[PDB]
Design a protein around this ligand. Structure first.
Ligand SMILES: [Cl-]
Ligand code: NA
Ligand code: NA
Ligand code: NA
Ligand SMILES: [Zn+2]
Ligand SMILES: [Zn+2]
Ligand SMILES: [Zn+2]
Ligand SMILES: [Zn+2]
Ligand SMILES: [Zn+2]
Ligand SMILES: [Zn+2]
Ligand SMILES: [Zn+2]
Lengths: 108, 108
């Protein structure tokens, strides 16, 4: 399996941004989403399509439809500037596949 | 790439336990380790062989040797009872490979 996402997007403070991932695995398997900030370990912000791990703000939401999955940030904050990666189970047992990441810039 | 780990081990409160993963990827790429508790998202306890994410207790440590990687918990506490999964970059671009997991039972 393979996944594709746009390499970069911006959002203004307080606006909404949607980051989408596409690939065949997404018809079968739920997407998860990682946030990567400089000097930190990656953080799961969404898993199993739309569930938020403990402590993740509700301004992060996930959805899917068909061969696409999306991460939406509603009311973007300065701290949300990060690289975001979609992932899912891969066709190979015990493997996961990732998108190439989307760099989010938050302006204002 | 593929990774193997023993399915189960135990540790007494206050003792040390080492969970080991084996596979060819580990000679060249660093392992990460996830803790999985029921009803929660997976939590990265070690990444990039030996680094601990923010907030993870220093009783968790990681190492590697040859085609193996190890998670050691020194001074196990009751809350450490969980499933632990090793992972690494896979031979396929943008893929990760995982072991099958090790169920850790903490006794006492
Ligand atoms: Cl500790
Ligand atoms: Na997390
Ligand atoms: Na984490
Ligand atoms: Na127990
Ligand atoms: Zn694949
Ligand atoms: Zn391809
Ligand atoms: Zn297709
Ligand atoms: Zn900036
Ligand atoms: Zn593989
Ligand atoms: Zn095989
Ligand atoms: Zn400590």
């Amino acid at each position: 399996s393979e996944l594709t996402q746009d390499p970069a997007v911006s959002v203004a403070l307080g606006q909404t941004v949607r980051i989408t991932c596409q690939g065949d695995s997404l018809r079968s398997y739920s997407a998860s989403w990682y946030q990567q900030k400089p000097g930190q370990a990656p953080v799961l912000v969404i898993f199993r399509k739309s569930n938020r791990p403990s402590g993740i703000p509700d301004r992060f939401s996930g959805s899917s439809s068909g061969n696409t999955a999306s991460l939406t940030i509603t009311g973007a904050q300065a701290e949300d500037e990060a690289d975001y990666y979609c992932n899912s189970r891969d066709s190979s047992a015990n493997h996961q596949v990732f998108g190439g990441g989307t760099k989010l810039t938050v302006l204002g």
